[PDB]
Amino acid sequence: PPRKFIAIDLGTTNSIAYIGGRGIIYNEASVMAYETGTKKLVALGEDARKLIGKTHDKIEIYTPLRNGAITDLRIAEEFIQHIGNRAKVQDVWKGSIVLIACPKSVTELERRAMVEMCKHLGADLVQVEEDTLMAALGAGANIFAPKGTFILDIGGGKTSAGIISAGGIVVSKSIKIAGNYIDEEILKYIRAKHTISIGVVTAEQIKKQIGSLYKGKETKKMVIFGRDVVTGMPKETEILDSEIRKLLISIFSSITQLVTDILESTPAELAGDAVMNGLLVSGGCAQISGLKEFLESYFQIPVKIAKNPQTAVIDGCIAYEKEIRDRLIEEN
Ligand SMILES: Nc1ncnc2c1ncn2[C@@H]1O[C@H](COP(=O)(O)OP(=O)(O)NP(=O)(O)O)[C@@H](O)[C@H]1O
Ligand SMILES: [Mg+2]
């Protein structure tokens, strides 16, 4: 009666859950909506993300993570349980082997609490791994080889960079300059340069639709809808990709600096691997147009943009199944 393997990518922006024999059962926003002042969940995932900034007084929004850190442990615990309910499997936790991948900013205290909760739910084994380690494996690097894997993971709450070798993280660092920061800067820029008020939904759509870090073959622009800063009256304006590219390049100076900082702290034998083989890039922001060109021009090493940039962590978790199963056989 093989034990069920359950894997959870717990992320600031999105979370993914996988159950062996079922595949991915959840791949949606890390957001919940409750009837205000009650325990009644009214939305989870994408339906809850849509409610952000669009609620009335009797709906409120909770997010288990903010900038890679747990906001409220009970909220995080309930979120995990609601994710598991999406499986439609009775007693899904019972006798299960659970792998949770989470940001480094989740404390050991919070990790142990998640372990104990899943154990309370029926799990026979619970292990917690750093998202950066799983991302590199899922994005295709042999993290187990004695060889330096150079990873950059640009998410919503955090950007992390590190060197991986021989099954573990050798050195790493995370910064707050990531997707959420970028979209807030676009919002601020639009107000400052176009004297128009927009929200974060529009700023993110600008970033996804016309954002770039290098001039592409295609010139793009956008019409956006907002309110005049002066009159509060309805207003629409055109945003050019060139003005957003200038902004993104300036913002990404902190991200190139992070990559340089990792290299400067890389042990010398591993640094030759990082330089010769180059950078592996994952996370949702790895999809920004021209990122590869931007990084290759600056660093003059190969840059691989993961083809699975948002499922890299869960895919690593799935690849890590034998390793987690061997930890249970051996704990006997
Ligand atoms: N096509 C896209 N182009 C650009 N950015 C995108 C795209 N799709 C998603 N994003 C951004 O990717 C970010 C989320 O990446 P993702 O790896 O799913 O985050 P996460 O793992 O939940 N957050 P974190 O805990 O910081 O790693 C958000 O800032 C999105 O706006
Ligand atoms: Mg992530």
Residue numbers in the entry: 17 to 348
Tell me, in the authors' exact words, what the paper reports.
MreB is a bacterial protein belonging to the actin superfamily. This protein polymerizes into an antiparallel double-stranded filament that determines cell shape by maintaining cell wall synthesis. Here, we studied MreB3 and MreB5 in Spiroplasma eriocheiris (SpeMreB3 and SpeMreB5, respectively), a model organism for studying Spiroplasma swimming. SpeMreB3 adopts a canonical actin fold composed of four subdomains (IA, IB, IIA and IIB) and consists of the same secondary structure elements as CcMreB, Thermotoga maritima (Tm) MreB and SciMreB5, except for the C-terminal region.
The crystal structures of nucleotide-free (Nf) SpeMreB3 and its AMPPNP complex were determined at 1.90 and 1.75 Å resolution. The SpeMreB3-AMPPNP complex crystal includes two molecules (Mol-A and Mol-B) with an RMSD value estimated for Cα atoms of 0.891 Å. Thus, the SpeMreB3-AMPPNP complex crystal also contains antiparallel pairs of the protofilaments, although their arrangement differs from that of the Nf-SpeMreB3 crystal. The angle composed of centroids of subdomains IIB-IIA-IA (ω2) was more constant than ω1 among our crystal structures (ω2 = 88.9° for SpeMreB3-AMPPNP complex Mol-A, 90.3° for Mol-B and 91.2° for Nf-SpeMreB3), indicating that major structural changes upon nucleotide binding contribute to swing the subdomain IB. These conformational changes lead to the interaction between subdomains IIA and IB', which are absent in the Nf-SpeMreB3 protofilament. The interaction in SpeMreB3-AMPPNP complex Mol-A is mediated through a hydrogen-bonding network and is stabilized by an electrostatic interaction between D289 and K70’. The protofilament model of the SpeMreB3-AMPPNP complex fits well with the protofilament image in an antiparallel manner, suggesting that the protofilament structure in the double-stranded filament is the same as that in the crystal. In the SpeMreB3 structure, D147 and K174 are located at positions corresponding to E140 and T167 in CcMreB, respectively. However, D147 is far from the putative nucleophilic water molecule and K174 does not interact with water molecules. The residue corresponding to E169 is replaced by serine (S176) in SpeMreB3, which does not interact with K174.
